[PDB]
Amino acid sequence: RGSHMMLLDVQTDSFEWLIGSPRWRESAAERGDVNPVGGLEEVLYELSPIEDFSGSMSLSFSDPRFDDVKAPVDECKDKDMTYAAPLFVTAEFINNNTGEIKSQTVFMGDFPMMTEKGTFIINGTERVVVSQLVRSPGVYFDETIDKSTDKTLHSVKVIPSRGAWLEFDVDKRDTVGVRIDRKRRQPVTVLLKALGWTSEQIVERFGFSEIMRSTLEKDNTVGTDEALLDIYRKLRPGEPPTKESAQTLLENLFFKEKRYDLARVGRYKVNKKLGLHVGEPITSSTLTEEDVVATIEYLVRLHEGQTTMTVPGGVEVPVETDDIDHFGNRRLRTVGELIQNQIRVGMSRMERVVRERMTTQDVEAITPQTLINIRPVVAAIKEFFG
């Protein structure tokens, strides 16, 4: 849902943050912000490094910056042009075998710039981007009725401030599934195994549950390594899954600050809902293995109509659905954030082309320029402002 009223300065400030401008940077310094990071800068950090198969080579990105706008606002209006500045990044390829470090400045596309008015000029026409209201970070459980089995179904979403989604559900076949980063549904035990759980510990913890026993048996995965590869096959279909890269991908998905952030309030709400770390200061806002396991147990106990639970070392909490019409469960997404998310999608596709080119290119010939295709980044921006 788009906003019905916007605060202008919130939006213009969000854009300055996105492009990491001098005035955003100085304002951060004045507030005494700890480690100020711009929007584009954060995206580049999120994907660095891109490693090949064997962890020999890597490509990293840094220092997003702009040349001057191609043309004045009036001229863009009078000649029907797009008011924009060329975006550049520094890209660095490293061969771990030889210790070669090969770096160059890479053009990433012309980037539409916001005006004094908080507008963009796109092919001559002045336009306003509208912010959006989205669900705030937290863990949300829901109950529905199937059409048509007459069965009562349950599901849960873990929503961060920044990063991939994590969803669990009990379907009409009475199996527990996981959807990682909105991908295809997998038996939930595949995720447990991927995190290092043996069949024995899964049964110790979840053996009370009929649907969990049934899920484990019908789970066609044998061992942690197989589980890791299957998640890789789901997240990166068509690419050669390896152990080490599957570990890194899953680790970075949820459990490290690089690509995932519940933020302090989301971290608080997850603790509260699940009954974890009750008298403790919030330090990190990443997800933990403990969170994942307690979320599954919550969903499963909810399904069997239980009303309380206590995780190992935690405190008792009520087991119930979240009304999820409540305010506080809605959150503002600024224009800078919307553009930031769009860039991220473009880069992720660029990121995939890099991995694919790493499989075939001669390592001794590789530079950032031979690996980097900016078309999906350019296309993502074009789509956004159309």
Partner: protein
Amino acid sequence: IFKVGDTVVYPHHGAALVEAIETREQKEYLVLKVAQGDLTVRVPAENAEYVGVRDVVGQEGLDKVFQVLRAPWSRRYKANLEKLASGDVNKVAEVVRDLWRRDQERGLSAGEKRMLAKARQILVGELALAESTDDAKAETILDEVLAA
């Protein structure tokens, strides 16, 4: 053996300018600039041969080397010790020149004859590559440069 301002061929990239020699757990790094694609390449000096990068003395350098070979004590020993160390063909040249001229007259110490014989080894190895010949006619060029 890599000097700032020299140009070297970097396979797959082309002509690279030696722009600097850094120190970067801590070893010696070549900073190379390929104008083609404005590419910066940093590579550990010891690894340069593996990657197919060689600094071969160009015509500018051959002149200088021959110019210095023709140009007109614990202190002197340690200076020359230091020149052989630097792997700079111009320094080696100075060592060869000074020791050889002394060997024609007063004669050298056993230690110095060893220093001279080694400096020549280094120098003809470098000359051989520079005149694209192979270690037989290089020394001959050296002697004639020396005799004259």
